[PDB]
Amino acid sequence: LTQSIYNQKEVTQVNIPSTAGELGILANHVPTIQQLKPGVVEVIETNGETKSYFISGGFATVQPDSELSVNSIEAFQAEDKSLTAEAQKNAQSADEAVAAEAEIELEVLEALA
Amino acid sequence: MQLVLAGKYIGAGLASIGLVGAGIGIAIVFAALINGVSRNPALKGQLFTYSILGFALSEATGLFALMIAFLLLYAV
Amino acid sequence: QLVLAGKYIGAGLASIGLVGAGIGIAIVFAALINGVSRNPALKGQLFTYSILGFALSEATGLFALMIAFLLLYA
Amino acid sequence: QLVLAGKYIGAGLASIGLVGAGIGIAIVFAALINGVSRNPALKGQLFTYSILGFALSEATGLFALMIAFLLLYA
Amino acid sequence: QLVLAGKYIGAGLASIGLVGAGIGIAIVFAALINGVSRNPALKGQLFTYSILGFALSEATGLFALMIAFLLLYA
Amino acid sequence: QLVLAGKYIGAGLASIGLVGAGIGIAIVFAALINGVSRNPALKGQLFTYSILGFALSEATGLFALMIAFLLLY
Amino acid sequence: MQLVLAGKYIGAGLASIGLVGAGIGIAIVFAALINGVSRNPALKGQLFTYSILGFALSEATGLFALMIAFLLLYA
Amino acid sequence: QLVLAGKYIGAGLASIGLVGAGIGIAIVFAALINGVSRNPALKGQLFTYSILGFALSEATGLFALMIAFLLL
Amino acid sequence: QLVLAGKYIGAGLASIGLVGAGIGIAIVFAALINGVSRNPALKGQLFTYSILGFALSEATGLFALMIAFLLLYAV
Amino acid sequence: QLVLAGKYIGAGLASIGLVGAGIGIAIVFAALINGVSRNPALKGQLFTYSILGFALSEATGLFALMIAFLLLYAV
Amino acid sequence: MQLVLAGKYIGAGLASIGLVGAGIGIAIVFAALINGVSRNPALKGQLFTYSILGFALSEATGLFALMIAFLLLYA
Amino acid sequence: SFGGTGKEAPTFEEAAHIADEILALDTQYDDIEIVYNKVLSGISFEPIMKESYSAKAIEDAPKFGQYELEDDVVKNLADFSLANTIYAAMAEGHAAEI
């Protein structure tokens, strides 16, 4: 990604917001892979240390190695909007030129946290 | 009226076989409620008011079957 | 008695035809919950198809309940 | 007396042939929800097939309900 | 009279043999809806197999409706 | 009398076996339509394989239809 | 009075056929629970409150078919 | 009379055992297409297993038909 | 004689309710095998849930066995 | 005579228990094709587990054929 | 007494229908076994023990319908 | 063929502006191979030919059954990997240039 955060050393606990619904991959999980949707992502170290990230797309390749892989475009902490309110209204109102650009930019703001 | 009472009791037990549709039914509703929330959890408060809707509609069907069964015992 | 036996046995066998409406409404609401959970933006349109799917499934059971009411009171 | 009994026994027994029309219409509209929730652009097309799906499904159940009426009259 | 009592009870039990047509025709437009949903450009082919498939399941429903009419007027 | 009445009741019970054939013939296209949709380049084989699918299910439905007719005539 | 009591014991056996819907019912609820926790273990404490509400309403239908058989036995 | 009538009622009751062959044999054909559609290279193998799944499920239907014709 | 026959016929009709337990227990364990497969990290939790769910589906078949045992041994 | 009639009726009612075998055999083979199509490298293994489930379901299918054979010729 | 003995054999054939739940039940266990052993072909020793545990309690519901069937023939 | 690629360090937005154009012309090839330059210790460049699997090839795999995609789109797996091979080729070949 534009940033690189996680090594592949130790098994950890992570949740994923998939297109088949928000799931959870722990330990020797089945190589279940499908595209993720722009939403919140919860990551927790051992003993319950609270962390968080964000995802704007990509898959989550899993192999019987007890280690999860995740790729996206955005990967920052949650701590890191009047212009978006106009960009949201400007997306709601689109003419005959392909609207598709309008709807997609609002599905990433559905998290809003 | 010996055959009358005997008919009131066999048909009443046959009127309880219609409770299978409600027994399987309510399960299928809550099956999708679990298998739907387990996917997208943010739709919890939404699908829960819709799992409580299909339940009362399927439970009322078994109520119709239980109505006939309770009518043959105490009425006509 | 033999006249009254057919009114009671058959009317109890009439609610056995209510299994389809009991499972039916569920399958509609099941795919409804299973479908809206996958695409929440289509919920309003799927509801007009779920209410329609439940009413027609209930109607087949109301036909069985109607025969049960007749034998006793007709 | 014995004939009139059998008319009403099979009257409620013919209403059991409505289970298939109960679960049936559901499966049509359940697949409609399970099919539309995946592809929204195919609503008006599959909606004409969902009507054709439930109509042929309930018409069968009406044939079983038809016998129940034929047993009551003649 | 004992003979006629068996013509009208068995006719009510012969209509339940059509339940499979109520669920079977549902599976047509359940697979058809689920078939068009997987690929919209296959509506011309799969719909011909749906009309063919539903006609095969409905053909067995007439057989249960045939014996029931052979037990009423034949 | 009772022989004639039982020969009519058993015929009405033999037609219940058409539900299995009514569902047996059904489930066949549930994979045909859903199999061609996933891969249209196999319609030539999936159709031939689905011909014997309902044929064997029709045979089980033509056996109960045979018994009921043996009790009618 | 020998036939009235005989029909009392026949319908009570037919009233226990309604327990099939509760047997398959409770299974379907816990089937979604096991298949729901396996996909999303984070919703364990949430679906567990729906798995209780699920089978309790499905078993209640079987308690009605069980209620009739006892009314045909001792009443 | 009572013997002959019980033979005719019991014969129609023994034909209900063919319902299990209906749903049964159909699943073997349904899983077949569902299994070949996902992998067309496994046609020659699973076709020899679909016949096995039908003949053993059809032989049970002959036993249900045998009892029906032992009463007739 | 007429009562004793109604006790025996209905006793076999009361064993029809065991079908709901046969298909029921299967679906629970089928969800267990399918659930443990998709995530073998919760076998200690899915076993605690499968047994807790199985003990409720066998109860319905137990009631159908109870009435079947009650009929032939009740007055 | 009235016993012989009940022996004939009960024989046809005992063959209804073969439905669980007819549907049952298929559901096992439904996973046999499913298991091979999802992973063709498990044909020699899962085929032994597909006949295993077939035989256990067919073993209980003999009982519905055994009881029906006891009513027409054994007694 | 012929009516009692007839109803004894009638209920004996109606009690064998309860084996259907075990016939389909044992199948669904292998329907998920071969499925799960093929979906995640890495754990056979774990899921195989739950497949025997499931079919045993599923066949036990059929043995109860077999128990009643024997009590309605020689008791 | 577009010019104006290497004015600075290439970004991801310019990869989708050329990768989708490969899919915009025609589908055609199922044997797409990318040619870039490997770099080790910055001593010299390396002439090789890397390969990018295609949808038909991706699905036709002898040992693919270990994955359990929920019957979703397998076509986007190639376009996501192809547009990321280019970004992996416009970075190691951008180091053999320096």
Numbering used by the authors:
A (entry chain H): 15 to 94, 101 to 133
B (entry chain Q): 1 to 76
C (entry chain R), D (entry chain S), E (entry chain T): 2 to 75
F (entry chain K): 2 to 74
G (entry chain P), K (entry chain N): 1 to 75
H (entry chain L): 2 to 73
I (entry chain O), J (entry chain M): 2 to 76
L (entry chain G): 148 to 245
Q: What is the paper's account of this structure, in its own sentences?
A:
The mitochondrial F1Fo-ATP synthase produces most of the ATP in the cell by rotary catalysis and plays a crucial role in severe human neurodegenerative disorders (Kucharczyk et al., 2009).
Crystals of the YLF1c10 subcomplex were obtained from the 1YLF1Fo complex. Whereas previous crystallographic studies of similar complexes (Giraud et al., 2012, Pagadala et al., 2011, Stock et al., 1999) used an excess of nucleotide substrates or inhibitors to trap functional states, we crystallized YLF1c10 without any such additives to ensure similar conditions for crystallography and cryo-EM. A detailed comparison of the YLF1c10 crystal structure to the bovine (Abrahams et al., 1994) and Saccharomyces cerevisiae (Kabaleeswaran et al., 2006) F1 and F1c10 complexes reveals that the three conformational states of the corresponding α/β heterodimers are very similar in the two yeast species, with root-mean-square deviation (RMSD) values below 1.7 Å, while nucleotide binding and C-terminal regions of the bovine β subunits differ. Aligning the γ subunits in all F1 X-ray structures and comparing the relative positions of the conserved P loop in the βDP subunit, we find that the YLF1c10 P loop is shifted to a position that, in bovine F1 (Rees et al., 2012), would indicate a post-hydrolysis or pre-product release state. The post-hydrolysis position of the γ subunit in YLF1c10 agrees with the presence of bound Mg·ADP in the catalytic βDP and βTP sites. Since YLF1c10 was crystallized without added nucleotides, the ADP originates from ATP hydrolysis during isolation or crystallization (Abrahams et al., 1996, Gledhill et al., 2007).
